[PDB]
Structure 1
Amino acid sequence: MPGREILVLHVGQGGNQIGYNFWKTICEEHNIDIRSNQRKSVEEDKVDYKSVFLVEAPDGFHPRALFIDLEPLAVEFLVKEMKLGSFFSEDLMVLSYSGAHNVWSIGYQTGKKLIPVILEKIRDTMPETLQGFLIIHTLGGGTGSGFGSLLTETLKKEFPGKGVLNFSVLPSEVNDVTLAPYNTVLSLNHLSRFSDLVVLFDNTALIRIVKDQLNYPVIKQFSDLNFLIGRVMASITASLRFPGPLNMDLMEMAHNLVALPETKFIIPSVAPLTKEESEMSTELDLVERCFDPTHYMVNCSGQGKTISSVLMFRGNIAIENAFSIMTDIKSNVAFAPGVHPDLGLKYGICESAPVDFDKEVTLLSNNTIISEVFNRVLERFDSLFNRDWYTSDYVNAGTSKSNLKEARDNFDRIIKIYKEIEG
C-alpha cells in the first residue's frame, strides 16, 4: 500500500559517509544484499514494509536517497572502497567539482546552483505519498552545514505538509575545524526556522561510546563511528518497516517531542551496544542506560532535565515490563519542573530486533541540557566574532557580519527558551 515513504538526502563528506552505515543497516535488516540489490533469500524474507526506505524495481532494490556534495572525492572514494557502485548509483549523485572550503556561506550559495537538478530528481522519483525527508549532514564543515541548511529551507518551502527531519553532527569538544562555530550557529539558526526535528550527535560522545561501551581497540575509519548514527536512524523507524504492537511515524514522534515550537533539538541514545548484553539485560536496565549521559550521543555534563522523550522498544520485549517500569523512570530520571508525573513518555514497540540482538531500546530526548551544549557553541562563536576573525570569506559569499550577528542572537534566544523551561 502506497504511503509512508521517506527520501534521505546525504550532504557533504560526513553526511555521505554516514550514509554508507545507514543503508548497510537498512539492507541487512530487510535481508537485502547491498552489493547485488537482491533479497538474500525468499525463505528468510520477513513480513515487512521495504518501501519506507527502499525502491523495488524489477532488477532489485535501490535506496530512496540522493548523494550530494560540492566536491567529488568523499563520495567516489567511499563508493569504490565499500563497493557500492550498483546501490549508490550515478543517477542518485549530485556532485560538483570544488568544495565549500569549510565556509557555510559558500556551501549555501554554491548549492543554489544545484537546487534545480535536485528538485527535478525528487519530483521525478518520489511517490505522491512521500511522507517527508531526512537530511544527513555535519554542521562543522561548509557543504553539509550550508548546503544542508539550504536544502532544509528549500524542501520545507517546496513541500509543505511533508516532514523535514535533520540528523546533524555537531563538532567535537575541541573543534577540529576552527570555522565550526560560525558554521554551526548559521546551521542551527536555519534549522530552527525550517526543520521539524533536529536529531543531534557529536564525535566526542561517539568516540567515547565506541571506546567505552564497545571497547573497540582502534577506530581506523569513520565507519567504526557512524554505525551508531545508522543504528539510531534505523531503530526509530523500525515500527514503520516491521510488525509490532505499537507503531509510530516521523511526525508522530516530533509531535510528542516538541513542547514549544522552538524546542526541536533532540539528543539520541541507544542500549545495549553489543549482542552479548542484549541477551543479559532487562527492559529496565536498558532504559536506565539510555537515560545515562554515558550513552547520550551528544557530549553532556549530566542528565539535564528531560522535557519529553520517545522510547522505541525493539525485539523480544516484555510489554508488562515496558509499562511497569514507567513509574521507575519518572521517579529516577530528572524531568523538567513543569512535566506532570504521568507524562513525558512516548512508546513505540516493534517485534523486529536489530541484527543479532535479542532486544534494544532507543531514546530520543528533548532535554534542557542542550542549552549547555549550545552555550558552549555560542561562547566559541563569540570568541571569534568579537575579534572579527575568519569573517572575510563569509562576507565575500553573501553572509554579512550583520547576518552573522542576527543568526547568533536568534540562536541565543533558543538557548534561553530551553534554560527557562529548565527552571
Structure 2
Amino acid sequence: MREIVHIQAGQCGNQIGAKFWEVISDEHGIDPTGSYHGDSDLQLERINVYYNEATGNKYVPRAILVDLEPGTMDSVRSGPFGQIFRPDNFVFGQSGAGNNWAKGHYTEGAELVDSVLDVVRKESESCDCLQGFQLTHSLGGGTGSGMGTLLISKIREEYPDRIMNTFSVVPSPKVSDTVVEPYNATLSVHQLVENTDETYCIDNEALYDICFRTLKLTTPTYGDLNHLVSATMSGVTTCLRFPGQLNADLRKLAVNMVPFPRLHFFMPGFAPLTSQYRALTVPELTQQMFDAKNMMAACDPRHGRYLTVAAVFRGRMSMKEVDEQMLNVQNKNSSYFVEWIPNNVKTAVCDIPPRGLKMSATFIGNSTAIQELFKRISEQFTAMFRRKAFLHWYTGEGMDEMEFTEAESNMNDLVSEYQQYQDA
C-alpha cells in the first residue's frame, strides 16, 4: 500500500488543493513544469505516494480537479504550479452550483459525477496498490459540499475497502459567503459521518482568529487562511511522503485514531504559526501544538477529552527531548486524555523540515470538544430552519423538508455520541 489518489472539489477545494500541491512539490524538489531539480534521494523515495512518473522522467500529481463552473479551475491553470496537473484530470461543468447543496448533490453535480469517476478510475487502474483517497473541499458552498459528498458516496460504492480521508473547511459567519452555509454544512456532515474514515475539520473561524490575533494581519484574505491550511496539510502527510523506519500508511492511522467509527472528526494544529529568525526549542513546539490558539478547529480542548492524539515533529532535533516533552504534557494534564485508552498519544519524528522553518510540529487530535463545532452549526441551522427560511432554493431542486430534519437529527446524535465519552 503506497498510492493515494487526491480529489479537490469546488472553489475552496481547488484553492487549498493547489496550495497543498505547491507546498509539497517544493519539499520534493519538483518544479512548476514537473521535473525534479532537488538533491536528496529522500525526496524521491516515497514520491510514488502522490505522483506518477511520466515520459522523460516528469512527475505528475495523482490529482483530479473538480468544479461545476470553469472559474476556479481556469485560475489554477494560469496559476504558478498549473502546468504540472494532468490536463485530462480537469473535469468541469459550466452552469455552477449557486452555493446550493442540492445542485451539487442531486441535479447539476449528478450530471458531471460519472465523468469525474472515469478519471478517478483512470488514476486508480495505474496504482500498484491503491491505499486510499483524500478530498479537499468546503461544506459551506454547493460544489465542494454537495458534489464532494456525492463523489465520496460513489467512490465508496466502487472502492468499498479503501480509505477515505477529507480535508473539510467547515464554515463560519466571520468568514461567510452566504447565509445558507449552515444548511449546506449540516447536510454534508451527515454524509461524512457515514462515508469517511478520517475527516480533518478545518474551521474558517479558527483560521481567521489565527490570522487576525496571533499573526497581526488586520484584514486577512482567503490566501492568508490557505497558507495555514497548506502548511497543516503538509504536516499531517509528512510521514507518508518521507522515510522511514517507523514508516506509515493511512489504514494504520485510521485504525489507531478512531475508537468508534462515527467519531473520526479530527482537530488539526500547527507550530510555529507563520506568514522566522529564532528557531523554537522542543518544549515550545510541544507547548504551542497543544495550545488552543494553534488549533484549526475552533474548539477549546479543555471543554472535552482526547480519545487519541497523533503528533508529527519535523526537523533535526533530540528524539530524547521530544519523548520527554510529550510525556510531560500527558503526565501534567492527564485529566484531558481518556484513561480507558492506554498510550493514546503517538509521536513521530521526521528529519526533513518544511520551507522556511528549521523545526515544526503538526498536531492531530480526536477530542470530544469537537462537538462544539457541530453544536455551533446546529444552532445556526435551526435559527433559519425553524422558520423554513431560504428552503425554497433547495425545494426547487427536488429536496424535501424531511431530509433537513433527518440531517439535523443525525448531527445532534453525533454531538450526543461525542458527549457520551467526555463523561465516561
Asked if Structure 1 and Structure 2 have the same fold, meaning a TM-score greater than 0.5 normalized by the shorter chain, the answer is yes
2:12 matched to 1:20?
A: no
Q: Structure 1 CA distance, aligned partners of 2:84 and 2:223?
A: 17
C-alpha displacement of 1:42: 5.3
Q: What TM-score results when the alignment is normalised by the length of structure 2? A: 0.92
Deviations 1:276-326 (A, max 9, x none): 37x532222212211111100112245332221110121113111122223
Q: Does 1:293 align with 2:295?
A: no
CA distance in 1 between counterparts of 2:420 and 2:398 reads: 34
Q: Secondary structure at the match of 2:34?
A: coil
Deviation at 1:32, TM superposition (A): 1.0
- Which region of structure 1 is more displaced relative to structure 2, 118-127 or 194-203? 118-127
C-alpha deviation, 1:380, in angstroms: 0.9
The answer to which of 252-261 and 325-334 deviates more is 325-334
Q: 1:219 to 1:40 in 2, by over 3 A?
A: farther
SS in structure 1 of the partner of residue 172 of structure 2: coil
> Structure 2 matches for 1:256-275, cutoff 5 A?
256-274=256-274
1: CA distance, partners of 2:337 / 2:217: 39
Structure 1 equivalent of residue 105 of structure 2 = 108
* Cα distance between partner residues in 1 of 2:199 and 2:399: 23
Conserved in 2, the CA contact under 8 Å of 1:246 and 1:350? no
Kindly report which structure 2 residues correspond to 1:249-398, keeping only aligned pairs within 5 A, or say none: 249-274=249-274, 276=276, 280-301=279-300, 303-304=302-303, 305-333=305-333, 335-336=335-336, 338-340=338-340, 342-398=342-398
User: 1:32–1:249: structure 2 CA closer, same or farther, 3 Å change rule?
Assistant: same
Question: Where do 1:50-89 residues align within 5 Å?
Answer: 50-59=47-56, 60-80=58-78, 82-89=79-86
1:183 aligned partner: 184
Please list, as runs of the form range in 1=range in 2, the aligned pairs for 1:209-228 lying within 5 A after superposition.
209-216=210-217, 219-220=220-221, 222-228=222-228
Whole-Å separation in 1 of the counterparts to 2:40 and 2:246: 26
Q: Report the Cα distance in structure 2 between the residues aligned to 1:42 and 1:307, rounded to whole angstroms.
A: 40
Spell out, residue by residue over 1:35-90, the C-alpha distance to the aligned partner (whole angstroms, 9 max, x if none).
x211124578745311111111024121111110001112212332x244422343
Q: Can you give the 5+ residue segments of structure 1 that lack an aligned partner in the other structure?
A: none
In structure 2, the gaps of 5 or more residues are none
For the aligned residue pairs, the C-alpha RMSD in angstroms reads: 2.1
Q: 2:270·2:289 contact (CA, 8 Å) conserved in 1?
A: yes
Q: Tell me the CA shift for residue 275 of structure 1.
A: 9.8
SS for the counterpart of 1:262 is: coil
Query: Are the equivalent residues in 1 in contact too, given 2:22–2:81 (CA < 8 A)?
Result: no
The alignment's TM-score, normalised by the length of structure 1, stands at 0.92
Quickly say closer, same or farther: Cα 1:226–1:337, change in 2 above 3 A.
closer
Asked whether the 8 Å contact 2:306–2:368 carries over to 1, the reply is yes
- Residues in 2 aligned to 1:91 and 1:302: alpha-carbon distance in whole angstroms: 43
SS in 2 for 1:369: helix
Tell me the residue number matched to 2:207: 206
> Structure 2 CA distance, aligned partners of 1:227 and 1:190?
27
Letter in 2 for 1:359: M
Number of the residue aligned with 2:34 = 37
Supply the distance in 2 between the matched residues of 1:289 and 1:242 (Cα, whole angstroms).
Answer: 24
SS of residue paired to 1:300: coil
Is the 8 Å Cα contact of residues 3 and 128 (structure 2) preserved in structure 1?
A: no
Cα offset for 1:217? 6.3
2:90 matched to 1:90?
Answer: no
Q: Quote the offset at 1:246 in angstroms.
A: 2.3
Of stretches 233-242 and 84-93 in structure 1, the one that deviates more from structure 2 is 84-93
Percent of paired sites with the same residue: 32
Deviating more after overlay: 359-368 vs 238-247? 238-247
